[PDB]
């Protein structure tokens, strides 16, 4: 059913590989990894962060508002 | 059997002179073969086969051809 041999039909695709004992496990890990991470972060920061920033603003206001509510009201004890 | 015929003998002579620098007589080949036993076969195969990175060439409907990591793992035995 789902086995290597009849999954799909592919033609004229040549793949070149290398032995894991002939290549480095961390090739250019920081020279190319760090720029790549920045690219990925930049592409997603404007789609992931903004919703969470709203939560932080709501969380701060709610915490402050709850504190203010418990605070003493001088006008209530006037007269 | 390969040395039956004038053309095979000439090819053997030329190739031997190009590669070995000399024509190896069949007597020397037989002596070298007779030197071979089970221990020699095991040792040489271990030297050249056991736990070695191979080169693979596939062509055609080779979707089932095992991944190179799997083939490399197949190039050694856990039991041994």
Automatic annotation (TrEMBL), chain A:
Gene Ontology CC terms, in alphabetical order: mitochondrial inner membrane; respiratory chain complex III
Keywords (A to Z) from UniProt: Electron transport, Membrane, Mitochondrion, Mitochondrion inner membrane, Respiratory chain, Transmembrane, Transmembrane helix, Transport
Transmembrane stretches, start-end: 44-62
Broad class of where this protein is predominantly found: mitochondrion
Entry annotated with the keyword Manganese: no
Subunit organization: Component of the ubiquinol-cytochrome c oxidoreductase (cytochrome b-c1 complex, complex III, CIII), a multisubunit enzyme composed of 11 subunits. The complex is composed of 3 respiratory subunits cytochrome b, cytochrome c1 and Rieske protein UQCRFS1, 2 core protein subunits UQCRC1/QCR1 and UQCRC2/QCR2, and 6 low-molecular weight protein subunits UQCRH/QCR6, UQCRB/QCR7, UQCRQ/QCR8, UQCR10/QCR9, UQCR11/QCR10 and subunit 9, the cleavage product of Rieske protein UQCRFS1.
Protein name: Cytochrome b-c1 complex subunit 8
The gene coding this protein: UQCRQ
From TrEMBL, chain B:
Signal peptide: none
Localisation per UniProt entry: Mitochondrion inner membrane
Residue intervals passing through the bilayer: none
Family as reported in the entry's similarity comment: Belongs to the peptidase M16 family. UQCRC1/QCR1 subfamily.
Subunit field text: Component of the ubiquinol-cytochrome c oxidoreductase (cytochrome b-c1 complex, complex III, CIII), a multisubunit enzyme composed of 11 subunits. The complex is composed of 3 respiratory subunits cytochrome b, cytochrome c1 and Rieske protein UQCRFS1, 2 core protein subunits UQCRC1/QCR1 and UQCRC2/QCR2, and 6 low-molecular weight protein subunits UQCRH/QCR6, UQCRB/QCR7, UQCRQ/QCR8, UQCR10/QCR9, UQCR11/QCR10 and subunit 9, the cleavage product of Rieske protein UQCRFS1.
Name of protein: Cytochrome b-c1 complex subunit 1, mitochondrial
Organism name: Sus scrofa (Pig)
Residues of the full protein shown: 401 to 480 of 480
